[PDB]
Amino acid sequence: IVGGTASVRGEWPWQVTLHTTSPTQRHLCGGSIIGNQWILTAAHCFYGVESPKILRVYSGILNQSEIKEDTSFFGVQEIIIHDQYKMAESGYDIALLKLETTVGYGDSQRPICLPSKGDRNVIYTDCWVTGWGYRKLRDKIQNTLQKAKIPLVTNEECQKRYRGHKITHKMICAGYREGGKDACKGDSGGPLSCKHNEVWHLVGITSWGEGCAQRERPGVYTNVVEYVDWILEKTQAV
């Protein structure tokens, strides 16, 4: 996260850190708890991931230093990537991780509500992007989970900012015209969480942008409300 500040423990209890153990263990991407065996994240996170066996999901983490060999984690049973996904810039950048065991909810780890299909017309004015990503173009994964408040940008304005791309209604953009605050490397797959009527909703999934926090280059997020039926199809299968 560029231009953010340290989060307080328990502030974003749906936020997870997804680690890979191959070739060595490291943070790969962010993700959000949406159900007791389900993590919602970005499809592009899994480029070259040949098996869910190399993955570890850590919940209730503020600092990456809380993670050692003896730290508990959730194994991944299945990686579900949207069938239309080709690359982040073309959309459908969404994936589900089915966990091997159930998450016990508490004050350190609990799910975030998905947006309502009836709330496609609501205007979110209190949106935040979180993660352990870079704070600048050439940096490293941060120890402390960072947060930054960012305004949503209309599809029309985001399209003007990305001349050679097609910004679809399955994408949602966020950023300041002057830049300064944005997601960066290591934040992808994490949430864009918006508070509406005292309830937090998972509005976006950190997906891509041209560089980080540049003037007139908003962050591009998977527009979660457009995938609510896809999520339910995969998580509520008979």
Ligand SMILES: COC(=O)Nc1ccc2c(c1)NC(=O)[C@H](C)CCC[C@H](N1CCC(c3c(F)ccc(Cl)c3F)=CC1=O)c1cc-2ccn1
């Ligand atoms: C010590 O352990 C490490 O060092 N780990 C480490 C280090 C670096 C990386 C990664 C892990 N993970 C990856 O490689 C995976 C496979 C994801 C690949 C894409 C990812 N991006 C690109 C787009 C993006 C973005 C933006 F820039 C602006 C705005 C918005 Cl909305 C965005 F979504 C954010 C972002 O996280 C990214 C992560 C890394 C390296 C390069 N890119």
